[PDB]
Design a protein around this ligand. Structure first.
Ligand code: NA
Ligand code: NA
Ligand code: NA
Ligand code: NA
Lengths: 250, 250
């Protein structure tokens, strides 16, 4: 399994000028080892990103809608994205699940549609504070995964990457250990093997999507079932290359 | 009050190539009379629209988020929009209120933020099938407007355009008459005059956002309180210039 680092700029930066300055930096970074690098940026900066970003890396949407086009004011669609040559989208990020209130059914249709339409997806999952405390994280994460599975057409698992987000560790006052990340990534893999088979499970990159920084990326990379990262604030910083380069420790 | 025609492409077209072909057509259209023309397009096509669209017309976002930037995966913000030179956003479109479940509080903060940050807004409102049938459209629309009013900073009403959407007439089996449009636009104006004063009310463009087509734009334009249109499917068609040019009948 090739190590996978997604950089999720989220709703950043503020200006097209900042985004270009940031691309320029990324374009000069010396990548060490073997690693699949994907960068997700807001819709408006996607064209400038697709054109200027180093061609050995890939550009991602941070979301897409369920339909190809239509009466969906404000929504961006898979065809629009692909029309720029963009091959990736993020789906199901906690912030969308919580703030924009995206439910599993919505996200299932989004995955089905994206995959049926040639996209590769970064599908996020993760449990909240209460299930963590109840010792019911495995169950909660299985339910999310069981909802995702029927969306994946045959022959498409090669185009699926799954990201675990320790949402219980985001704005709650609690922090996740390296052991936690390994453990939940193992939970997802085991869930895959049980439900869709070992060959699939052994090839699907599962990423840790908690807090990844230069000070922790190496230990995290070393975990056997962590295949890479969905990086947050460090996407916008020079330390992003440290994180990409943590692959040598996996 | 200068006649105002907004073209809302919604989630269309599918490709950047189609969007450029459509801009080219728009760029050749002979505008008659006096009219303020604004074109709203999906986030990804906004750069190509800002660069190529005739400079006597203006480009619009179809939505923006409440914050300048941050942990809001998938969201586009006012600063990103303004960084391209884009001065307009649509807010509160029925499709967002319904499909993406945007409530009034959300939309109020979105208007406050946009206006405080130099944007001009097309704020949509409109009642559903049940209030229409109950004869309670005025009340329902006032509640929406009363929620919008405190968002508008002093000196900013010059940057506000309000669009009435007969949602009761969208996918319900019912059609709106020209009289209906005039009547609801008058309701909004009267609501403005009562609450924030006659001078404001007399200057705010109020638009009809129902079904506007070449076959009805002229009669609709003639209504005294209809100041223009938020155009749907006809935005994507050559008849859009007929609609822009309906201003001569107002
Ligand atoms: Na395949
Ligand atoms: Na590893
Ligand atoms: Na002003
Ligand atoms: Na008129």
């Amino acid at each position: 399994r090739t190590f996978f680092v997604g950089g999720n700029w989220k709703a950043n930066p503020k200006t097209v000028e900042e985004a270009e300055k940031l691309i320029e930096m990324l374009n000069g970074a010396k990548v060490e080892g073997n690693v699949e690098v994907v960068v997700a940026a807001p819709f408006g900066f996607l064209p400038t990103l697709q054109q200027k970003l180093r061609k050995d890396w890939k550009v991602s949407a941070e979301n897409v809608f369920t339909k190809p086009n239509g009466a969906f004011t404000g929504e961006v669609t898979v065809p629009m994205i692909k029309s720029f040559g963009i091959e990736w989208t993020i789906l199901g990020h906690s912030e969308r699940r919580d703030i924009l209130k995206e439910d599993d059914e919505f996200l299932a249709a989004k995955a089905k549609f994206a995959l049926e339409n040639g996209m590769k997806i970064i599908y996020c999952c993760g449990e909240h504070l209460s299930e963590r405390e109840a010792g019911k994280a495995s169950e909660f994460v299985s339910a999310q995964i069981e909802k995702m599975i029927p969306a994946i057409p045959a022959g498409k698992w090669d185009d699926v990457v799954i990201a675990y987000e320790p949402i219980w560790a985001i704005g709650t006052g609690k922090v996740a250990s390296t052991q936690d990340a390994q453990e939940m990534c193992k939970v997802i893999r085991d869930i895959l093997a049980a439900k869709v088979g070992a060959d699939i499970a052994n090839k699907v990159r599962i990423l840790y999507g908690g807090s990844v920084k230069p000070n922790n990326c190496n230990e995290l990379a070393a975990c056997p079932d962590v295949d890479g990262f969905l990086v947050g604030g460090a996407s916008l910083e020079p330390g992003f290359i440290n994180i990409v380069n943590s692959n040598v420790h996996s």
